[PDB]
Amino acid sequence: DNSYKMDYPEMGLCIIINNKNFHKSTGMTSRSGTDVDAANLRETFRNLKYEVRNKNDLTREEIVELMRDVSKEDHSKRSSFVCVLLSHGEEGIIFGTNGPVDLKKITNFFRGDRCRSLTGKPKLFIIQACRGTELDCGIETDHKIPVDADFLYAYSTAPGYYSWRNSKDGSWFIQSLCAMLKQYADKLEFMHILTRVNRKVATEFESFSFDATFHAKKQIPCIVSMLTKELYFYH
Amino acid sequence: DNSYKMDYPEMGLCIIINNKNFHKSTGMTSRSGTDVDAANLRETFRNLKYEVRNKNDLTREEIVELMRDVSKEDHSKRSSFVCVLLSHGEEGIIFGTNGPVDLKKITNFFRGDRCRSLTGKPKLFIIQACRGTELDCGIETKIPVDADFLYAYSTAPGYYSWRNSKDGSWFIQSLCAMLKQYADKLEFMHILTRVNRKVATEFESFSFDATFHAKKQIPCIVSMLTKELYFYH
């Protein structure tokens, strides 16, 4: 038994929180091309057999609340839990429409002692948001368990860095995560899928700008795993 | 391709920074039994065919200076790079014998653009050090310059890291055990996943004082790798 039990009646919920438009008081631009991401996500996870629920333009208060409700549901019949966050952010932070929520505040609702029906089941958080402003110039070659266990955070960039979005095909990371889940969810283990995602983002993408500052910029996502087991979507 | 090229003339360097004794001005206590870890790590990585270099009780300047030099070597004929840190720490920082060093400072020496002979090769950083003071109560029952890095932390962000003076630290004890048993079989991520399960299930703190009793720990895999990693073939 080196892999999670994924043959529970349901695979689980998959909450997509999609933030496109922010209050004038924040002074944050609208996130163009994000609805593409939310639609790609919804289809991908439907196919994996997740119970998808899309939420658009949520406030900081609305995020906490939705996470509170979802955490208090009964996940006994559910294999796992997934939560995708699409928005602006900084290191450790995602923005609701009216301002910042600490990621740790949304994730703690699910800590193995606050959501018993998820204990020992994989908690997955996919985060498409900036973790800072650094830009990657690239380089040429062309029993008891810990309450913090069973979490996986799949960030779109390295700590400190900007996360790139294309207005037409959505964010680099989500685009690549979906393509890769569709292609490999039936064969590969989840780390190996996210690893392939890393290569796709790292090698197939390069920013374009009339501004040399913002031009030719690269990106690598960042996989963060406190999973105790192998994770396969198929049985 | 899917897997890193691990058939260069050499596996690579495995630098082990092991700090036991700290300077009086630090107020820091000595890290009893840490040598057990350093020893264990030495045998393990030697058996993985790495050129192992052990360093004991380095200052913050010495650590930075050591990393700077290693990053300036020619790693052309080397498959990967490994550096293990055994010391006191805080979120994002490890301790020299005489004070703090930002981790980001030591890793930056090996950024794809600063260590050109390591570009496209796995850079592994294994960190046995606190990332804060929190205790876990537990519960019932062209490429990017930041690419090809992996961090094997002993704990989750914000948390303390447990060590047994005699038997070795929970994490390094489990890592070494797991590498010994599986480096010839599994891909690295899956090894480290076994490390998590092992630390999470097999270890539990004991104290006469409730504050410190029955505490748990989970390690934290941070991967910006772009390929699978097999220590063989």
**Closest Cα in chain B to A227:** B193
Which candidate in A75, A83, A88, A115 is catalytic? A88
Residue A95 per-residue DSSP state: E
Nearest to A49 by CA among A2, A85, A14: A14
Contacts of A8 (CB under 8 A, 6+ apart): A77, A78, A79
Q: What is the largest CA-CA distance in chain A?
A: 58
Nearest to A148 by CA among B125, B119, B174, B156: B156
**Closest Cα in chain B to A222:** B224
Look up tokens 């060590």; give the residue.
B163
The answer, for B4 touching chain A at a CB cutoff of 8 Å, is no
> How far is residue B64 CA from its own chain's centroid?
16
B145: nearest CB among A120, A136, A216: A136
Is position A88 annotated as part of the catalytic site? yes
Look up tokens 């900007």; give the residue.
A162
The tokens describing B204, both together, are: 């539990």
The answer, for B211 touching chain A at a CB cutoff of 8 Å, is no
Q: Which amino acid is at B115?
A: C
Give the start-to-end residue ranges of the domains of chain A.
1-235
> What CA–CA distance (Å, rounded) separates B86 from B95?
9
Q: Which amino acid is at A94?
A: I
Is position B83 annotated as part of the catalytic site? no
Q: Using a CB-CB distance cutoff of 8 angstroms, which residues of chain B are in contact with residue A218?
A: 142-145, 147
3-class state of residue A48 by DSSP: coil
CB atoms within 10 A of CB B46: 12
Look up tokens 């004929």; give the residue.
B77
**Closest Cα in chain B to A198:** B226
Is the Cβ pair B221, A225 closer than 8 Å? yes
> What CA–CA distance (Å, rounded) separates A89 from A163?
9
> What CA–CA distance (Å, rounded) separates A47 from A37?
15
Nearest to A115 by CA among A103, A107, A124, A104: A107
Q: What is the DSSP string of chain B?
A: --B----SSEEEEEEEEE-----GGGTPPP-TTHHHHHHHHHHHHHHTT-EEEEEES--HHHHHHHHHHHHHS--TTEEEEEEEEES-EETTEEEETTEEEEHHHHHHTTSTTT-GGGTTS-EEEEEES-S-SB-B--EE--B-TT-SEEEEESS-TTB---EETTTEEHHHHHHHHHHHHHTTTS-HHHHHHHHHHHHHHH-----SSGGGTT-B---EEEE--SSB--S--
**Closest Cα in chain A to B192:** A228
> What CA–CA distance (Å, rounded) separates A93 from A105?
10
| A144 DSSP β-pair partners | B140
Q: Please count the residues of chain A.
A: 235
The tokens describing A16, both together, are: 């997509």
Q: Which amino acid is at B43?
A: E
> What CA–CA distance (Å, rounded) separates A147 from A119?
8
Q: Using a CB-CB distance cutoff of 8 angstroms, which residues of chain A are in contact with residue B220?
A: 224-226
Is the Cβ pair B144, A218 closer than 8 Å? yes
Is the Cβ pair B147, A198 closer than 8 Å? yes
Element (H, E) at A33: none
Which candidate in B75, B88, B115, B176 is catalytic? B88
Sheet of strand B99-102: strand arrangement: B89-90, B93-96, B99-102
Q: How far is CA A149 from CA A110, A182, B29, B219, in A?
A: 11, 27, 29, 9
Which candidate in B130, B137, B190, B220 is catalytic? B130
- Packing angle of the helix pair A172-184, A190-204 (nearest 10 deg): 140
> What CA–CA distance (Å, rounded) separates A197 from A226?
19
**Cα-flanking dihedrals φ and ψ of residue B201, to 5°?**
-100, -35
Is the Cβ pair A203, B216 closer than 8 Å? no
Q: Report resolution (Å) to 1 decimal.
A: 2.6
Look up tokens 């058996």; give the residue.
B47
**Closest Cα in chain B to A229:** B193
Residue B191 near residue B225, CB atoms below 8 Å: no
**Cα-flanking dihedrals φ and ψ of residue B5, to 5°?**
-70, 105
Query: What's domain A1-235's architecture?
Result: 3-Layer(aba) Sandwich (3.40)
> What CA–CA distance (Å, rounded) separates A46 from A35?
16
> What CA–CA distance (Å, rounded) separates B8 from B211?
50
The correct CATH number of B1-233 out of 3.40.605.10, 3.30.70.360, 3.40.50.1460, 1.50.10.10 is 3.40.50.1460
Nearest to A201 by CA among A234, A170, A176, A227: A176
Residue B35 near residue B21, CB atoms below 8 Å: no
Residue B94 near residue B87, CB atoms below 8 Å: yes
> What CA–CA distance (Å, rounded) separates A37 from A45?
12
> What CA–CA distance (Å, rounded) separates A185 from A44?
10
Pairing assessment for the beta strands A151-155 and A123-128 based on DSSP bridges: parallel
Is the Cβ pair B223, A189 closer than 8 Å? no
Interface list for B 82-111 with A (CB within 8 A): 104
Classify residue B45 by burial, with Cβ atoms within 10 Å: 0-12, 13-18, 19+: buried
Is the Cβ pair A148, B141 closer than 8 Å? no
Element (H, E) at A105: helix A103-108
Nearest to B139 by CA among A226, A76, A75, A113: A113
Is the Cβ pair B139, A144 closer than 8 Å? yes
Q: Is the dihedral of CA A227, A229, A231, A235 positive or negative?
A: negative
Q: Is the dihedral of CA A117, A122, A126, A132 positive or negative?
A: positive
> What CA–CA distance (Å, rounded) separates A65 from A60?
9
Cα torsion for A35, A135, B123, A89, to the nearest 10°? -50
Nearest to A51 by CA among A16, A11, A8: A11
